[PDB]
Amino acid sequence: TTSAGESADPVTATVENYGGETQVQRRQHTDVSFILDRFVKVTPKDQINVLDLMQTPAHTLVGALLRTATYYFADLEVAVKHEGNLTWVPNGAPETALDNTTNPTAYHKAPLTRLALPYTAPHRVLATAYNGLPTSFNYGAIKATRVTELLYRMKRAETYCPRPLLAIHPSEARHKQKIVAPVK
Amino acid sequence: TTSAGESADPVTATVENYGGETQVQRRQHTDVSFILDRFVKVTPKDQINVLDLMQTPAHTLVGALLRTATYYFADLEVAVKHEGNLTWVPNGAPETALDNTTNPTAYHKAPLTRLALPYTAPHRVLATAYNGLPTSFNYGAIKATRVTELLYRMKRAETYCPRPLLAIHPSEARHKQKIVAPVK
Amino acid sequence: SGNTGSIINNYYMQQYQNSMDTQLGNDWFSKLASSAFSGLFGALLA
Amino acid sequence: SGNTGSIINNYYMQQYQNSMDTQLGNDWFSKLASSAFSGLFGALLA
Amino acid sequence: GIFPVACSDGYGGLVTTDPKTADPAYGKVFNPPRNMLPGRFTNFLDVAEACPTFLRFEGDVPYVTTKTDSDRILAQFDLSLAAKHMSNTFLAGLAQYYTQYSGTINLHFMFTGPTDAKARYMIAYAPPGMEPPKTPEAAAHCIHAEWDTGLNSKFTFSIPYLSAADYAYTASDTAETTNVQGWVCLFQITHGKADGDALVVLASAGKDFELRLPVDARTQ
Amino acid sequence: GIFPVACSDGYGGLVTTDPKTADPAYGKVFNPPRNMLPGRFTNFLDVAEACPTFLRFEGDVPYVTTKTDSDRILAQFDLSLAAKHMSNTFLAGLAQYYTQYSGTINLHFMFTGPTDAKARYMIAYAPPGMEPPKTPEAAAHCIHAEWDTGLNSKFTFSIPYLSAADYAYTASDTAETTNVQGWVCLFQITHGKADGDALVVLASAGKDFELRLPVDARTQ
Amino acid sequence: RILTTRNGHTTSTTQSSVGVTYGYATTEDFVSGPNTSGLETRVVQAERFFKTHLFDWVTSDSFGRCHLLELPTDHKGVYGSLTDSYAYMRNGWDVEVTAVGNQFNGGCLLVAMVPELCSINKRELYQLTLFPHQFINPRTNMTAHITVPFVGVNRYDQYKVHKPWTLVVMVVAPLTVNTEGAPQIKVYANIAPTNVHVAGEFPSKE
């Protein structure tokens, strides 16, 4: 299939150009809302954990596929292992508001605490890259006596204006791994 | 009932050939999906357990009735006693993917963890004998800090092209066992 | 179908409980066992 | 919509489970991918 | 408030044969297409009925040879599925994983001698209660069937289910039963120049054969 | 009394990919309006199909230059998505988070030489099973496509999915596969005064390209 | 019991035909799958008989001596050229095994098509009847005819690394040379692939 390659219109070619037939596709694993709706762990601080999604590592699945977008919308789901009582404050709250139990405070029950947090930012969408370290937009903050594990989960995820993904660069021709297989 | 015995057509004879009558049968215990839908224990490794159904012993019920087929289809059900957090990766995943919690990770709750795993192989059916130790086809892998007990359960089992079953060969005319009975 | 005996429908959808089958375009030994010659071959006297 | 597979409706209302959307007054790359030129440009012989 | 429940003691333990299913963790997986694959079997008794398998005799052979002497007993064994003659069949390989059976057991007697070798055989069923016969004239008072060789080489005899109970055990533990469920008695009546030829015999499940109460003992 | 339930063992543990939702704590929050924002994408394969990205060659360049000597091999690589030529594409950046794929991979060959520079190129698919060709006369017996430069500068070739299984792995662990899923072979046939000009090449997903079983290994 | 079977332009007529055993299916499964994207071709020139000496059956051969023939075999015809030209193939097999003696021999052979016969024991030879099979009994016949389709975990197979079918021939009763019988029986195979399909043509060596 010849075309004007500089016009940047999307041009796809099929196998039917040389006598094949294009088959059916199931793309339910590469859609945005499905693939981002899973927990990813971040390294927590000792007490105060500002909840923004740039604490996710960039080499993880949710981190890299999150940083694929320029803009995003999500509600948040957090699962915290903590000592004492976990306290959440929304976006724009002072840090002394983290010392009050009238703010949403989940008392300790073993082994962890799983709670749903809404979108509390004053912006219509958030950003992965801000021209202007982006602006102080986040999902509030939590604190306990100590926080040992902190998980995020993006739900109702929407993404806008895609940005590059980079795979690992091999030293030889192919990047080889040890794919799991039985010994015998 | 006389026939051509070399033609290998199926020929059954009844008691009605000598004045009897054939009775009704209930065969709900020898069908494939019922008899294979039960847990069988395998010997686990210390951390990494590649989930394939040839870890089942050949003298068990599910192992021998599994190895009766050439081809099979099943979803999988696993019940694991483990220390730490149990992590599952699908078929084709690297082993370093077993070190990440974004993959399906069941946190520890006493006494065990029972979870359902789908069919994740790129083949239409799996194999008990491969002409070519068969090829690396399996149901993924799990790991924890240590795994103490590992159970399988085949659900929606389908079997194709049957192969031999062998009973134990007695030394005298009949294989005698101690069938459970009261002393008095 | 197998060793399941609950009468209440499942809480999870079929998309999350099992793998979904795909059509293209029991079961042989049932027909091979049902096609078994059962009578007699010769001429039955008495 | 996402990674949810329950068939029983939620115990909580929509006002308490999620943030509620507001109207004023997928989705571009679906139309950009569907508008891809798929055929041939020249005159196909044989 | 909220809905009160009573968490009952004795309920909720993991039983390895429960009708419950596990919770999912990994959703919307579509399988490759699998329709119209050859060799589909849904029940093990379908392939046990449709496919007979050989018996075993002394010398580890699937056949029995015609003796030419005064004593005319050809083979004799039990209706245990755990018998030594039945031990290499598929029917015993199923029956080792079940405690009870019922119904008819088919035996297939096909003759592999030359065209100038003739024979006449007799199969008999000795019910339990007295010792089994040694002579065909003594076994003529049983349930028997007599046939001779010809153009059709295979003869199928259906050993019937005669018992007090409607289900019979598939083994003894170790201790003692005598020879319960009786005997299968293979006799030859006459032979003409059949010296040393083979009669091979298969065994399969009958039409009303059923096999219930699954169990795992050992020996896959 | 009250309703009895059996709290089952093995159920209720926190799985990181469960279809369940958390309990709310902070209700009736209304979002700012968000309708008709530009750049909405709902599936990563939509932007993988609609937007091709460059390949990589030796010297870290998205192009390949026309050689003028006896050997006329221009580029050659594998149908691993983990290949070194595919390593800077968006399609491999998606494919590192999935274990299996299927379908067609489009390659876009557009020519950036002057108007007095002509060339004729050949793209070929070597299936796995024997070693890939070194000559265009040897690759003429493959699935190939030949084109020449003119008014239309870009030529799109659709590398087909030929495999035994209907899904193919996106990597090897480390140990050993030879070069499974075959080779992509770029050859030049003729050139006229095209000495040292560039042929740049993009890669994108086909129309029936699909990518399943999400995984997280490393390297964001 | 006269039967004439024909593949391509090759004909085989027998007069001791007890029947044809269709194993595991009578028809072929679905050929055009999603794994080759419609790039298939049926080769009508490759579905014809080829011959192979199998073994020689004598009196010293007791119960259970097998002969295994993994299909496909070394083939110098068109079907052999299909394996060196294409990456993926698909076929069933039409197997016709002859054991010519006379009707004054005894003994009995069991021929069977086994899928993926990678290892075999002694005792499970007792259940070789579980596979598509016929008996060769010199008292009655000297011809066994078994037709069988393609099986596998994949719908197309690459035959240079995997051979799915195995023709096994087993002595179930030893041969006798009663005074007018033949002293030994040379056993022959007559095999023809059915419904072959190729995909993914190779580069040449020229």
XYZ file of N, CA and C in Angstrom, chain B:
552
model
N -23.408 -64.338 21.184
C -23.392 -63.439 20.038
C -22.102 -63.585 19.246
N -22.204 -64.156 18.052
C -21.070 -64.280 17.151
C -20.966 -63.042 16.274
N -19.741 -62.732 15.858
C -19.473 -61.585 15.004
C -18.106 -61.770 14.369
N -17.700 -60.772 13.592
C -16.332 -60.686 13.097
C -15.525 -59.913 14.131
N -14.705 -60.627 14.904
C -14.019 -59.998 16.021
C -12.863 -59.118 15.600
N -12.411 -59.263 14.358
C -11.267 -58.509 13.873
C -11.665 -57.176 13.252
N -12.962 -56.932 13.049
C -13.396 -55.716 12.364
C -13.335 -54.507 13.286
N -13.238 -54.746 14.594
C -13.135 -53.782 15.694
C -14.343 -52.859 15.796
N -15.496 -53.245 15.270
C -16.724 -52.538 15.592
C -17.105 -52.863 17.028
N -17.694 -51.927 17.768
C -18.142 -52.248 19.125
C -19.339 -53.183 19.102
N -19.204 -54.299 19.810
C -20.244 -55.312 19.921
C -20.467 -55.555 21.402
N -21.685 -55.321 21.870
C -22.054 -55.598 23.251
C -23.026 -56.772 23.254
N -22.976 -57.573 24.306
C -23.923 -58.657 24.502
C -24.676 -58.420 25.799
N -25.933 -58.830 25.824
C -26.793 -58.637 26.977
C -27.093 -59.975 27.638
N -27.751 -59.897 28.796
C -28.266 -61.101 29.443
C -29.522 -61.610 28.762
N -30.155 -60.778 27.927
C -31.359 -61.173 27.204
C -31.073 -62.232 26.149
N -29.797 -62.443 25.811
C -29.424 -63.541 24.934
C -29.666 -64.893 25.586
N -29.657 -64.961 26.918
C -29.983 -66.209 27.597
C -31.145 -66.046 28.574
N -32.088 -65.166 28.257
C -33.337 -65.105 28.985
C -33.408 -64.108 30.117
N -32.397 -63.262 30.288
C -32.418 -62.238 31.309
C -33.116 -60.978 30.834
N -32.877 -59.895 31.567
C -33.343 -58.571 31.171
C -32.336 -57.533 31.641
N -31.990 -56.601 30.758
C -31.038 -55.565 31.126
C -31.732 -54.467 31.928
N -31.075 -54.029 32.999
C -31.651 -53.130 33.980
C -31.224 -51.695 33.664
N -31.607 -50.751 34.519
C -31.330 -49.332 34.326
C -29.991 -49.022 34.986
N -29.300 -48.004 34.477
C -27.970 -47.637 34.945
C -27.961 -46.184 35.409
N -27.188 -45.905 36.454
C -26.898 -44.541 36.878
C -25.393 -44.335 36.775
N -24.958 -43.565 35.778
C -23.541 -43.341 35.524
C -23.107 -41.912 35.823
N -23.595 -41.329 36.919
C -23.236 -39.949 37.230
C -21.911 -39.860 37.976
N -21.283 -40.995 38.281
C -20.009 -40.984 38.986
C -18.813 -41.227 38.082
N -19.023 -41.672 36.844
C -17.921 -41.967 35.939
C -17.814 -40.960 34.802
N -18.602 -39.891 34.838
C -18.455 -38.824 33.861
C -17.256 -37.958 34.214
N -16.722 -37.260 33.213
C -15.396 -36.662 33.326
C -15.429 -35.420 34.207
N -16.454 -34.581 34.036
C -16.483 -33.290 34.719
C -16.741 -33.452 36.211
N -17.453 -34.508 36.596
C -17.756 -34.726 38.006
C -16.552 -35.286 38.751
N -15.886 -36.279 38.167
C -14.899 -37.067 38.896
C -13.585 -36.299 39.005
N -13.369 -35.326 38.119
C -12.124 -34.568 38.146
C -12.274 -33.268 38.922
N -13.482 -32.975 39.393
C -13.757 -31.715 40.081
C -13.632 -31.952 41.578
N -12.400 -32.190 42.021
C -12.083 -32.370 43.431
C -10.610 -32.057 43.655
N -10.254 -31.623 44.861
C -8.879 -31.234 45.139
C -7.971 -32.449 45.240
N -6.776 -32.311 44.676
C -5.715 -33.298 44.814
C -4.453 -32.559 45.246
N -3.747 -33.103 46.231
C -2.562 -32.422 46.720
C -1.344 -32.816 45.903
N -0.447 -31.857 45.729
C 0.847 -32.116 45.117
C 1.914 -31.699 46.109
N 3.119 -32.206 45.914
C 4.234 -31.763 46.733
C 4.740 -30.421 46.213
N 4.675 -29.358 47.004
C 5.086 -28.050 46.506
C 6.587 -27.867 46.638
N 7.092 -26.871 45.922
C 8.468 -26.448 46.107
C 8.524 -25.470 47.270
N 9.704 -24.894 47.491
C 9.854 -23.979 48.616
C 9.207 -22.631 48.326
N 9.611 -21.968 47.244
C 8.959 -20.709 46.912
C 8.179 -20.776 45.608
N 8.846 -21.078 44.502
C 8.238 -20.953 43.181
C 7.610 -22.282 42.789
N 6.314 -22.247 42.472
C 5.533 -23.427 42.102
C 4.932 -23.177 40.722
N 5.530 -23.785 39.703
C 4.983 -23.730 38.354
C 3.719 -24.575 38.310
N 2.601 -23.970 37.910
C 1.319 -24.654 37.993
C 1.027 -25.429 36.717
N 1.466 -26.681 36.684
C 1.022 -27.581 35.633
C 0.486 -28.860 36.259
N -0.419 -29.534 35.554
C -1.145 -30.648 36.152
C -0.375 -31.958 36.093
N 0.859 -31.950 35.595
C 1.709 -33.125 35.709
C 2.521 -33.147 36.989
N 2.282 -32.212 37.908
C 2.797 -32.359 39.260
C 1.936 -33.285 40.101
N 0.746 -33.635 39.625
C -0.113 -34.594 40.303
C 0.512 -35.977 40.229
N 0.473 -36.752 41.308
C 1.020 -38.110 41.259
C 0.163 -39.013 40.383
N 0.818 -39.955 39.705
C 0.112 -40.800 38.750
C -0.705 -41.888 39.428
N -0.498 -42.127 40.722
C -1.276 -43.131 41.429
C -2.522 -42.565 42.095
N -2.710 -41.249 42.074
C -3.907 -40.652 42.641
C -5.091 -40.831 41.693
N -6.266 -40.397 42.152
C -7.465 -40.503 41.326
C -7.438 -39.478 40.199
N -7.198 -38.212 40.545
C -7.205 -37.137 39.556
C -5.982 -37.239 38.650
N -4.878 -37.776 39.175
C -3.686 -37.937 38.357
C -3.834 -39.022 37.307
N -4.355 -40.184 37.706
C -4.496 -41.297 36.776
C -5.651 -41.071 35.807
N -6.768 -40.538 36.309
C -7.890 -40.256 35.420
C -7.611 -39.047 34.535
N -6.691 -38.178 34.956
C -6.198 -37.133 34.070
C -5.308 -37.712 32.982
N -4.375 -38.586 33.366
C -3.472 -39.210 32.407
C -4.140 -40.285 31.562
N -5.425 -40.560 31.784
C -6.224 -41.382 30.891
C -6.473 -40.694 29.553
N -6.424 -39.370 29.506
C -6.695 -38.636 28.281
C -5.394 -38.276 27.582
N -5.492 -38.020 26.279
C -4.377 -37.402 25.574
C -4.473 -35.889 25.670
N -5.666 -35.345 25.462
C -5.865 -33.906 25.494
C -6.909 -33.553 26.542
N -6.773 -32.367 27.127
C -7.706 -31.949 28.159
C -7.854 -30.437 28.140
N -9.004 -29.982 28.627
C -9.262 -28.581 28.908
C -9.807 -28.469 30.319
N -9.329 -27.466 31.051
C -9.855 -27.189 32.380
C -9.518 -25.761 32.756
N -10.406 -25.151 33.532
C -10.011 -24.044 34.381
C -9.398 -24.632 35.645
N -8.757 -23.800 36.453
C -8.051 -24.337 37.603
C -8.559 -23.669 38.873
N -8.538 -24.429 39.961
C -8.840 -23.948 41.299
C -7.691 -24.357 42.203
N -7.091 -23.398 42.899
C -5.968 -23.724 43.767
C -6.277 -23.309 45.196
N -5.816 -24.134 46.135
C -5.882 -23.848 47.559
C -4.486 -24.011 48.135
N -3.944 -22.931 48.692
C -2.546 -22.854 49.091
C -2.481 -22.468 50.563
N -1.709 -23.219 51.345
C -1.236 -22.758 52.643
C 0.163 -22.194 52.454
N 0.347 -20.932 52.825
C 1.589 -20.240 52.534
C 1.901 -19.250 53.641
N 3.165 -18.843 53.702
C 3.606 -17.755 54.562
C 3.895 -16.552 53.677
N 3.502 -15.368 54.132
C 3.702 -14.180 53.331
C 2.572 -13.985 52.346
N 2.842 -13.308 51.235
C 1.820 -13.017 50.243
C 2.029 -13.900 49.022
N 0.964 -14.558 48.586
C 0.988 -15.446 47.435
C 0.740 -14.661 46.154
N 1.593 -14.889 45.159
C 1.553 -14.137 43.914
C 1.439 -15.099 42.740
N 0.527 -14.794 41.816
C 0.289 -15.590 40.622
C 0.623 -14.786 39.371
N 1.295 -15.432 38.419
C 1.519 -14.855 37.094
C 0.960 -15.820 36.050
N 0.437 -15.326 34.928
C -0.151 -16.223 33.928
C 0.910 -16.916 33.088
N 0.428 -17.646 32.085
C 1.306 -18.381 31.188
C 2.052 -17.424 30.268
N 3.364 -17.621 30.167
C 4.220 -16.811 29.336
C 4.903 -15.673 30.060
N 4.672 -15.539 31.359
C 5.228 -14.424 32.103
C 6.652 -14.745 32.547
N 7.513 -13.740 32.704
C 8.842 -13.988 33.276
C 8.756 -14.325 34.759
N 9.865 -14.821 35.314
C 9.863 -15.177 36.729
C 10.062 -13.961 37.621
N 10.706 -12.910 37.107
C 10.808 -11.657 37.848
C 9.457 -10.984 38.028
N 8.490 -11.282 37.153
C 7.107 -10.866 37.342
C 6.467 -11.481 38.579
N 7.048 -12.548 39.131
C 6.595 -13.075 40.410
C 7.011 -12.217 41.599
N 7.793 -11.158 41.390
C 8.236 -10.308 42.483
C 7.427 -9.022 42.603
N 6.313 -8.909 41.887
C 5.549 -7.670 41.803
C 4.125 -7.924 42.273
N 3.580 -6.989 43.054
C 2.256 -7.181 43.636
C 1.137 -6.667 42.740
N 1.466 -6.044 41.606
C 0.431 -5.632 40.662
C -0.191 -6.847 39.983
N 0.603 -7.895 39.780
C 0.095 -9.211 39.427
C -0.801 -9.731 40.550
N -1.792 -10.633 40.235
C -2.781 -11.044 41.250
C -2.186 -11.663 42.502
N -2.308 -10.928 43.602
C -1.618 -11.225 44.843
C -2.624 -11.299 45.978
N -2.787 -12.489 46.540
C -3.700 -12.713 47.650
C -2.926 -12.586 48.950
N -3.295 -11.605 49.766
C -2.630 -11.394 51.043
C -3.024 -12.488 52.024
N -2.177 -12.703 53.026
C -2.312 -13.854 53.910
C -3.507 -13.723 54.842
N -4.348 -14.754 54.856
C -5.394 -14.878 55.867
C -5.467 -16.346 56.257
N -5.537 -16.609 57.557
C -5.543 -17.977 58.053
C -6.862 -18.659 57.698
N -6.860 -19.979 57.437
C -5.713 -20.895 57.396
C -5.109 -21.096 56.011
N -5.859 -20.791 54.956
C -5.390 -21.049 53.601
C -6.060 -20.061 52.660
N -5.636 -20.099 51.402
C -6.139 -19.212 50.364
C -6.653 -20.040 49.198
N -7.920 -19.851 48.854
C -8.577 -20.591 47.788
C -8.982 -19.620 46.690
N -8.374 -19.754 45.514
C -8.634 -18.837 44.411
C -8.759 -19.581 43.088
N -9.543 -18.994 42.181
C -9.861 -19.573 40.884
C -9.011 -18.911 39.811
N -8.402 -19.725 38.958
C -7.520 -19.276 37.904
C -8.041 -19.746 36.552
N -8.029 -18.889 35.538
C -8.570 -19.276 34.237
C -7.568 -20.069 33.411
N -8.030 -20.492 32.240
C -7.154 -21.118 31.265
C -6.394 -20.045 30.497
N -5.073 -20.013 30.674
C -4.244 -18.941 30.135
C -3.235 -19.431 29.104
N -3.385 -20.653 28.614
C -2.443 -21.214 27.659
C -2.750 -20.717 26.254
N -1.739 -20.600 25.395
C -1.988 -20.215 24.001
C -2.452 -21.348 23.104
N -2.651 -22.544 23.646
C -3.074 -23.703 22.884
C -4.568 -23.897 23.083
N -5.208 -24.594 22.145
C -6.644 -24.818 22.283
C -6.948 -25.871 23.342
N -6.105 -26.894 23.464
C -6.157 -27.875 24.541
C -4.726 -28.116 24.999
N -4.573 -28.725 26.167
C -3.262 -29.110 26.661
C -3.051 -30.595 26.385
N -1.897 -31.118 26.788
C -1.543 -32.488 26.449
C -0.975 -33.214 27.653
N -1.305 -34.498 27.761
C -0.695 -35.386 28.735
C 0.502 -36.128 28.162
N 0.526 -36.343 26.849
C 1.667 -36.941 26.175
C 1.995 -36.121 24.939
N 3.236 -35.673 24.829
C 3.690 -34.916 23.675
C 4.874 -35.652 23.070
N 4.845 -35.849 21.755
C 5.848 -36.684 21.108
C 7.179 -35.945 21.021
N 7.200 -34.807 20.336
C 8.387 -33.973 20.279
C 9.547 -34.557 19.500
N 8.778 -35.625 28.580
C 8.673 -34.245 29.037
C 8.021 -33.385 27.964
N 6.771 -32.960 28.198
C 6.058 -32.184 27.175
C 6.540 -30.745 27.075
N 5.872 -29.961 26.230
C 6.251 -28.580 25.971
C 5.862 -27.735 27.183
N 6.406 -26.525 27.306
C 6.120 -25.632 28.425
C 4.718 -25.052 28.252
N 3.704 -25.842 28.597
C 2.351 -25.328 28.743
C 1.840 -25.662 30.140
N 1.168 -24.693 30.751
C 0.877 -24.721 32.177
C -0.219 -23.701 32.479
N -0.465 -23.464 33.764
C -1.460 -22.509 34.232
C -0.823 -21.329 34.956
N 0.397 -20.974 34.579
C 1.100 -19.893 35.236
C 1.965 -20.392 36.374
N 2.239 -19.488 37.310
C 3.074 -19.832 38.450
C 2.636 -19.033 39.663
N 2.943 -19.560 40.845
C 2.709 -18.869 42.106
C 4.002 -18.889 42.908
N 4.150 -17.905 43.796
C 5.189 -17.993 44.812
C 4.779 -17.233 46.063
N 5.319 -17.675 47.197
C 5.200 -16.974 48.465
C 6.562 -17.000 49.138
N 6.588 -16.613 50.416
C 7.816 -16.747 51.195
C 8.156 -18.215 51.415
N 7.172 -19.013 51.822
C 7.259 -20.458 51.674
C 5.854 -21.002 51.472
N 5.754 -22.087 50.711
C 4.492 -22.752 50.423
C 4.535 -24.116 51.090
N 3.542 -24.404 51.926
C 3.546 -25.655 52.672
C 2.587 -26.686 52.093
N 1.468 -26.253 51.518
C 0.499 -27.186 50.959
C -0.074 -26.587 49.685
N -0.291 -27.437 48.681
C -0.752 -26.997 47.371
C -1.732 -28.015 46.807
N -2.952 -27.552 46.528
C -4.060 -28.378 46.065
C -4.518 -27.887 44.699
N -4.863 -28.817 43.812
C -5.449 -28.479 42.523
C -6.889 -28.966 42.449
N -7.651 -28.371 41.534
C -9.014 -28.810 41.258
C -9.385 -28.405 39.842
N -9.618 -29.395 38.988
C -9.987 -29.152 37.602
C -11.484 -28.914 37.489
N -11.871 -27.775 36.931
C -13.277 -27.468 36.711
C -13.534 -27.193 35.237
N -14.741 -27.556 34.784
C -15.131 -27.633 33.370
C -14.160 -28.507 32.580
N -13.916 -29.710 33.085
C -12.927 -30.593 32.489
C -13.472 -31.259 31.235
N -12.664 -31.245 30.178
C -12.953 -31.924 28.926
C -11.758 -32.791 28.572
N -12.020 -33.992 28.072
C -10.965 -34.938 27.747
C -11.137 -35.462 26.331
N -10.015 -35.810 25.705
C -9.966 -36.218 24.312
C -8.929 -37.320 24.154
N -9.252 -38.308 23.296
C -8.396 -39.414 22.862
C -7.859 -40.258 24.017
N -8.667 -41.174 24.567
C -8.280 -41.887 25.794
C -7.075 -42.808 25.640
N -6.379 -43.001 26.754
C -5.115 -43.711 26.884
C -5.272 -44.703 28.029
N -4.357 -45.714 28.152
C -4.556 -46.749 29.185
C -4.525 -46.340 30.657
N -5.357 -47.030 31.446
C -5.294 -47.061 32.906
C -4.772 -48.419 33.336
N -3.900 -48.440 34.333
C -3.356 -49.691 34.843
C -3.633 -49.807 36.336
N -4.316 -50.880 36.721
C -4.492 -51.225 38.118
C -3.220 -51.869 38.660
N -3.200 -52.090 39.974
C -2.045 -52.726 40.592
C -2.068 -54.219 40.270
N -0.890 -54.782 40.008
C -0.791 -56.176 39.600
C -0.612 -57.058 40.827
N -1.545 -57.960 41.124
C -1.425 -58.772 42.338
C -0.383 -59.868 42.193
N 0.107 -60.341 43.341
C 1.041 -61.458 43.347
C 0.313 -62.796 43.331
N -0.766 -62.920 44.095
C -1.633 -64.084 44.067
C -2.792 -63.760 43.116
N -3.838 -64.598 43.125
C -4.913 -64.492 42.140
C -5.723 -63.207 42.284
N -5.948 -62.742 43.508
C -6.695 -61.510 43.721
C -5.863 -60.533 44.531
N -5.997 -59.250 44.214
C -5.399 -58.198 45.025
C -6.289 -57.937 46.231
N -5.804 -58.292 47.414
C -6.581 -58.204 48.638
C -6.147 -56.997 49.455
N -7.130 -56.298 50.014
C -6.891 -55.136 50.851
C -7.668 -55.315 52.142
N -7.402 -54.443 53.107
C -8.205 -54.424 54.321
C -9.299 -53.375 54.172
N -10.474 -53.811 53.739
C -11.639 -52.948 53.598
C -12.155 -52.631 54.993
N -12.498 -51.359 55.217
C -12.915 -50.862 56.526
C -14.210 -51.528 56.983
N -14.189 -52.055 58.202
C -15.294 -52.785 58.781
C -15.187 -52.723 60.297
N -16.299 -52.802 61.030
C -16.209 -52.845 62.493
C -15.570 -54.142 62.970
N -14.935 -54.074 64.138
C -14.268 -55.232 64.725
C -15.325 -56.213 65.211
N -16.338 -55.701 65.901
C -17.425 -56.538 66.395
C -18.527 -56.701 65.348
